[PDB]
């Protein structure tokens, strides 16, 4: 069948290329609700996740931007304290005390 | 103690450690990392030069590891039952996004956050180009770095502001910068070194549309010919049997043979042998899928049907004659349009492509303008019989139909070979 | 070369098989050979020379030897361009000038190669003087017409002589099958 | 088709051959407009070409 | 080095322009990082008009 122009036109129509756009930034992993929900679960549950996707998706930056907005309870201060000149143990203190 | 260096494990305590599986196995680290995660503790890496060193207590692992990589990277890691036991949550990224006004606005916001100055037209053009990249009409490409790279080039070409014209220029330049091979090909076509019929009719030859391997993103037409001779029912694909093609069966040859054998049964076998060949060896033939062009060329050779040459034919076909979608349909259509426009648009040139590929038909602006002007035609077919009806310009059924002509040609070939049998007895 | 099918052999066979159908198969086996060892042969492109030589052997057509023949060919008999057309034309001109130009020597080359014809000054001078001729062809039938010095169609045309030779070979092979009779 | 000499003559005709030419230097990448424009873009944008 | 110096990493503020034959770059374009770093391709036509 001879495809008409209308059946072939796919480009969304412009109406003003002269109007600058002001848009709020999108949520991290926009259009990637599967990965976003997987990560929400892995974070809420403390599971180790793994992001899978074709290269150039920007997965690394979206992941960091998403984690930066998270907030965990303040982690305890971990440090190495020598119990002797040979034996050094791990000490965990309340945060800010080390 | 004061010489222990903090690693990623220590810097991530009570947080998240984002690794790269590609880097984990490129550096053989994944095994020790897995032992650490399973054990929940790790001591820092020591040197083999230590007499007795220190008795470091193993550092507790209190992070959440989040591996990142491509599916190929994780394929080599998801074999052991420990991986799937440690990393139970799989956050997979679709290589495409639903092409919706919401995703267009989200891309606009993402670009603004990246620093670009967009206009509505420029955002629209970038969104359309993302869809073009996805090769799908209703899915935009999810590769946001690639859209950002194109946006950077458009900002440069437009003075920092991404207007519609600037994005169009960026896309045009991106094509032009890789257009050398096609430039040489079009020069060969115009000078006559490569002779393509884009007008008139011819028997047993058609303009298939191929993607070249020298540039696996540019489509161009290829004259594909089929010659029918009396003989055994075997179908020769010269370009698949040019060495290493005799006792290695080709799924494409088997498909074409199955279609032809099952479709025309009025003799104990196909009384004809069809040789299919591409001239112009720039064709990267695929011995894994029979081409619709191959089938229609074979049918024209058999029935002596003068197919239209102004129409190019693309699309795979299965042994039932159903036309299957093919990859790079945009590249192929635009390549044939380039060739036709070079030789001058006759006003009747076109492409016969699978209707299965209508979801992938995101054609360049010039092809669409030619279509709207009626200078270029796109025919979507579902069956090889439909493609043959369009090419030969006649119906299959009825009197003076293509099917009866093919049966007549097969009858003539059968008569010639049974006349060889006449000689065999006499 | 036992199981290795050569695209050139397949192409020539396809042309000959589809072009001459008055017997259930080509009743003739054609042996093609360069009578020399300095020839580097391409198994991927069927030469136009191979095709016209085969057609002449079949139809017993005396071809002109003063004309050299170059160019690839596809199973439809269309003459495709070849590389190094300048080298080939100038090489044949060298050989002809060595033996003395007879005023009729020439080269039959693909018309597709007209965009590559940048012949040396001496070849062009001989062409202008009429001592050397360049024939550009598109189909192998044109090359055969030039070589055999006759037309394909019509009475006593080359195609009728080829069909007559094929008929004679078919009669001979069915003569051996006459021996198979009794 | 016997090609005439005129259809075969390809050499640029010399109208006078003893006159020393004085020509301005050509812009870099002359006849290579594709590469020249690619490099102009790579320079204007700081991309690695 | 016993422990060597604690040198700060030198910032890279140049534009790299790799030059070679298409054969040379084929062995380099298998990396999604390459096409991510070198995004401008300046091809030279082996002929000029």
Within 13 Å, how many C-alpha atoms sit on residue C121's CB side?
3
Closest-CA distance of chain A to residue E32, Å: 7
Chains C and B touch (3+ CB pairs under 8 A): yes
CA distance B378 to A5: 9
Which helix (H) or strand (E) is A62 found in, with range? helix A59-68
Selecting from B225, B242, B280 the residue whose C-beta is nearest the C-beta of C7 gives B242
The CATH classification number of B100-177 equals: 1.10.8.60
Q: Which residues pair with residue B230 across a beta bridge?
A: B272
- Angle, CA C100 vertex, CA C98 and CA C105 arms, to 5°: 100
CA distance B341 to B339: 6
Closest-CA distance of chain E to residue B286, Å: 22
What end-to-end distance do the CA atoms of chain A give, in Å? Answer: 76
> CA nearest E13 in D: which residue?
D46
CA distance B108 to A23: 7
B296 is written with which tokens?
């229609």
CA distance B187 to B368: 24
- Interface mutation vs chain D, best among B153, B154, B181, most D CBs within 10 Å: B153
Query: Which of chain B's residues have a Cβ under 8 Å away from the Cβ of D7?
Result: none
Strands B161-162 and B272-278: unpaired
CA-to-CA separations, E13 to B151, B250, C139, D40, E34, in angstroms, rounded: 21, 54, 61, 18, 18
How long is chain C?
A: 182
CA distance B203 to E36: 48
- In a 3-state reduction of DSSP, which class is residue B302? helix
What are the structural domain ranges in chain C?
1-175
Q: How many CB pairs under 8 A join A and B?
A: 250
Residue tagged 């990560």 (tokens): A39
- Smallest Cα–Cα separation from A80: which of B57, B54, B207? B57
Residues near A6 by Cβ (< 8 Å), separated by ≥ 6? Answer: none
Decide if C97 is catalytic: no
B360 is written with which tokens?
């992938």
B149 is written with which tokens?
């790279």
Q: Does D3 touch chain C (CB under 8 A)?
A: yes
Which helix (H) or strand (E) is B372 found in, with range? helix B365-372
Query: Which of chain B's residues have a Cβ under 8 Å away from the Cβ of C116?
Result: 193
Q: Does E48 touch chain D (CB under 8 A)?
A: yes
Residues near B54 by Cβ (< 8 Å), separated by ≥ 6? Answer: A86, A87, A88, B1, B4
CA distance B253 to B237: 7
Name the interface residues of B facing E (CB cutoff 8 Å): 145, 149, 153, 177-178, 180, 183-184
Instruction: Give yes or no for a contact between A75 and A98, defined as CB atoms under 8 angstroms apart.
Output: no
- Interface mutation vs chain B, best among D3, D41, D47, most B CBs within 10 Å: D41
- Smallest Cα–Cα separation from B351: which of B325, B330, B365, B320? B330
A72 is written with which tokens?
């965990």
Instruction: Give yes or no for a contact between C123 and C90, defined as CB atoms under 8 angstroms apart.
Output: yes
- In a 3-state reduction of DSSP, which class is residue C116? helix
- In a 3-state reduction of DSSP, which class is residue C28? coil
Residues near B288 by Cβ (< 8 Å), separated by ≥ 6? Answer: B250, B251, B252
Closest-CA distance of chain A to residue E37, Å: 12
Q: Does D13 touch chain C (CB under 8 A)?
A: no
DSSP string, D32-46: -HHHHHHHHHHHHHT
CA-to-CA separations, A19 to A6, A38, B167, in angstroms, rounded: 27, 38, 15
Helix ranges (DSSP H) in B95-163? 101-114, 120-134, 144-158
Q: Do B65 and A26 touch (CB under 8 A)?
A: no
CA distance A60 to B152: 19
C21 is written with which tokens?
């159908």
Residues near A74 by Cβ (< 8 Å), separated by ≥ 6? Answer: A95, B14
The number of angstroms, rounded, from the C-alpha of B172 to the middle of its chain's C-alpha atoms is: 21
E strands, B235-304, are 236-237, 272-278
Instruction: Give yes or no for a contact between B126 and A21, defined as CB atoms under 8 angstroms apart.
Output: no
Query: Which of chain D's residues have a Cβ under 8 Å away from the Cβ of E42?
Result: 34-36, 38-39, 42, 49
Q: Is the dihedral of CA B320, B322, B327, B329 positive or negative?
A: positive
A96 is written with which tokens?
């800010």
Residue tagged 């979608």 (tokens): B325
Torsion angle (degrees, nearest 10) of CA B357, B360, B362, B364: -70
CA distance B172 to B163: 14
* Residue B369 phi, psi (nearest 5): -65, -40
- In a 3-state reduction of DSSP, which class is residue B322? strand
Q: Which of B289, B300, B322, B405 is catalytic?
A: B289
* Residue C101 phi, psi (nearest 5): -70, 125
Which helix (H) or strand (E) is C69 found in, with range? strand C67-69
Helix%, strand%, coil% for chain C, nearest 5: 50, 10, 40
CA distance C151 to A54: 63
CA distance B31 to B45: 14
Selecting from E36, E40, E45 the residue whose C-beta is nearest the C-beta of B177 gives E40
Selecting from A22, A50, A92 the residue whose C-beta is nearest the C-beta of B91 gives A50
Chains D and B touch (3+ CB pairs under 8 A): yes
Instruction: Give yes or no for a contact between B407 and B264, defined as CB atoms under 8 angstroms apart.
Output: yes
- Smallest Cα–Cα separation from C89: which of C120, C131, C65, C62? C120
Residues near A64 by Cβ (< 8 Å), separated by ≥ 6? Answer: B18
CA distance B33 to B30: 5
Longest dimension (CA), chain A: 87
Residue tagged 């049974």 (tokens): B418
* Residue C157 phi, psi (nearest 5): -75, 165
Instruction: Give yes or no for a contact between E18 and E25, defined as CB atoms under 8 angstroms apart.
Output: yes
Instruction: Give yes or no for a contact between B142 and B93, defined as CB atoms under 8 angstroms apart.
Output: yes
Q: Does E49 touch chain A (CB under 8 A)?
A: no
> CA nearest A92 in B: which residue?
B60
Long-range contacts (CB closer than 8 Å, 24 or more residues apart) made by B44-51: B44/B4, B44/B5, B44/B7
- Angle, CA B265 vertex, CA B259 and CA B266 arms, to 5°: 150
CA distance C132 to B328: 49
Residues near B273 by Cβ (< 8 Å), separated by ≥ 6? Answer: B228, B229, B230, B231, B232, B233, B234, B235, B236, C17
Which helix (H) or strand (E) is B219 found in, with range? strand B219-230
- Interface mutation vs chain D, best among B149, B172, B173, B192, most D CBs within 10 Å: B173
* Residue C67 phi, psi (nearest 5): -95, 125
Burial B285-318 (b: 16+ CB within 10 A, else e): bbbebbbbbbbbbbbbbbbebebbbbbbbbbbbe
Helix ranges (DSSP H) in chain C? 7-19, 48-59, 85-98, 121-129, 140-148, 158-181
Residues near D4 by Cβ (< 8 Å), separated by ≥ 6? Answer: none
Determine whether D18 is exposed, middle or buried from the number of CB atoms within 10 Å of its CB (0-12, 13-18, 19+): exposed
Tell me the structure's resolution in angstroms, rounded to a single decimal.
2.5
CA distance A12 to A7: 13
Determine whether B137 is exposed, middle or buried from the number of CB atoms within 10 Å of its CB (0-12, 13-18, 19+): middle
The CATH classification number of C1-175 equals: 3.30.230.10
CA distance C36 to B45: 72
Query: Which of chain A's residues have a Cβ under 8 Å away from the Cβ of E36?
Result: 56
- In a 3-state reduction of DSSP, which class is residue C106? strand
Q: Does D41 touch chain B (CB under 8 A)?
A: yes
Closest-CA distance of chain E to residue B175, Å: 10
Selecting from D38, D44, D45 the residue whose C-beta is nearest the C-beta of B177 gives D38
Q: Which of C45, C102, C161, C178 is catalytic?
A: C45
Q: Do D45 and B179 touch (CB under 8 A)?
A: no
Residues near D30 by Cβ (< 8 Å), separated by ≥ 6? Answer: E48
> CA nearest E40 in D: which residue?
D49
Residues near B337 by Cβ (< 8 Å), separated by ≥ 6? Answer: B349, B351, B364, B366, B367, B370, B376
CA-to-CA separations, B87 to A38, B78, D18, in angstroms, rounded: 12, 9, 82
Instruction: Give yes or no for a contact between C61 and C54, defined as CB atoms under 8 angstroms apart.
Output: no
B266 is written with which tokens?
């009025």
Region of residue A49 (phi > 0: left; psi between -120 and 50: alpha; otherwise: beta): beta
Selecting from A30, A49, A72 the residue whose C-beta is nearest the C-beta of B15 gives A72
Residue C160 DSSP code: H
Which helix (H) or strand (E) is B205 found in, with range? strand B205-211
Query: Which of chain A's residues have a Cβ under 8 Å away from the Cβ of B361?
Result: 8, 10
Residues near B366 by Cβ (< 8 Å), separated by ≥ 6? Answer: B337, B341
Q: Does C137 touch chain D (CB under 8 A)?
A: yes
Helices B164-176 & B120-134, crossing angle to 10 degrees? 30
CA distance B143 to B94: 9
* C100 C-beta neighbours (distance < 10 Å), count: 8
A46 is written with which tokens?
């403390």
Name the interface residues of C facing B (CB cutoff 8 Å): 3-7, 10-11, 13-15, 17-18, 21-25, 43-45, 74-76, 78, 80-81, 111-116, 138, 170, 174, 177
Instruction: Report whether CATH 3.30.230.10 matches the domain B178-419.
Output: yes
Helix ranges (DSSP H) in B63-119? 71-75, 83-86, 101-114
Instruction: Give yes or no for a contact between C15 and C76, defined as CB atoms under 8 angstroms apart.
Output: yes
CA distance A4 to B372: 8
Q: How was this structure determined?
A: cryo-EM
Burial C167-180 (b: 16+ CB within 10 A, else e): eebbeebbeeeeee
Q: Which of C25, C31, C88, C178 is catalytic?
A: C88
């Amino acid at each position: 069948m001879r495809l008409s122009y209308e059946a072939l036109e796919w480009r969304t129509p412009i109406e003003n290329s002269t109007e600058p756009v002001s848009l709020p930034p999108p949520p991290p992993f926009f259009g990637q609700e599967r990965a976003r929900e997987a990560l929400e679960l892995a974070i809420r549950g403390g599971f180790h996740a793994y992001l899978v996707g074709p290269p150039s998706l920007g997965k690394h930056e979206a992941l960091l931007a998403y984690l930066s907005t998270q907030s965990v309870e303040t982690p305890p201060d971990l440090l190495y304290v020598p119990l002797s000149e040979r034996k050094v143990a791990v000490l965990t203190l309340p945060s800010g005390q080390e | 103690v004061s010489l222990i260096r903090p690693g990623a494990v220590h810097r991530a305590q009570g947080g998240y450690l984002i690794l790269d599986a590609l880097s984990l196995k490129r550096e053989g680290t994944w095994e020790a990392f897995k032992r650490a995660l399973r054990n929940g503790q790790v001591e820092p890496v020591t040197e083999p030069q230590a007499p007795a060193g220190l008795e470091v207590e193993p550092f507790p692992i209190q992070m959440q590891v989040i591996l990142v990589g491509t599916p190929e990277a994780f394929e080599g890691l998801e074999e052991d039952p420990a991986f799937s036991e440690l990393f139970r949550i799989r956050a997979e990224f679709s290589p495409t996004l639903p092409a919706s006004p919401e995703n267009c606005t989200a891309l606009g916001g993402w670009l603004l956050a990246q620093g670009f100055q967009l206009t509505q037209g420029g955002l629209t053009r970038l969104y359309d180009e993302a869809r073009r990249m996805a090769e799908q009409r209703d899915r935009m490409d999810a590769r946001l770095v690639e859209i950002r790279a194109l946006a950077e080039e458009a900002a440069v070409l437009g003075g920092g502001l991404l207007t519609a014209e600037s994005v169009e220029q960026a896309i045009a330049a991106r094509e032009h910068r890789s257009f050398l091979s096609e430039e040489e090909f079009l020069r060969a076509v115009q000078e006559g070194v490569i002779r393509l019929r884009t007008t008139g009719r011819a028997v047993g030859e058609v303009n298939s549309l191929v993607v070249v391997e020298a540039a696996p993103y540019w489509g161009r037409p290829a004259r594909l010919t089929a010659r029918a001779a009396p003989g055994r029912d075997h179908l020769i694909s010269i370009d698949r049997e040019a060495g290493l093609g005799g006792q290695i069966f080709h799924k494409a040859v088997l498909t074409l043979a199955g279609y032809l054998r099952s479709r025309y049964i009025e003799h104990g076998s196909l009384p004809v042998t069809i040789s299919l060949a591409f001239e112009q060896n720039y064709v990267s033939i695929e011995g894994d899928s029979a081409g619709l062009a191959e089938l229609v060329a074979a049918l024209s050779a058999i029935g002596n049907l003068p197919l239209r040459q102004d129409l190019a034919v693309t699309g795979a076909v299965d042994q039932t004659g159903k036309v299957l979608a093919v990859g790079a349909i945009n590249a192929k259509v635009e390549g044939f349009f380039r060739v036709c426009k070079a030789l001058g648009l006759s006003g009747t040139q076109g492409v016969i492509l699978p209707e299965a590929n209508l979801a992938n038909l995101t054609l360049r602006a010039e092809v669409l303008e030619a279509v709207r002007a009626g200078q270029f035609h796109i025919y979507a077919v579902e069956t090889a019989e439909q493609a043959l009806e369009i090419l030969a310009g006649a119906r299959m059924e009825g009197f003076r139909g293509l099917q009866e002509k093919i049966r007549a040609g097969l009858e003539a070939f059968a008569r010639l070979e049974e006349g060889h049998d006449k000689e065999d007895r006499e």
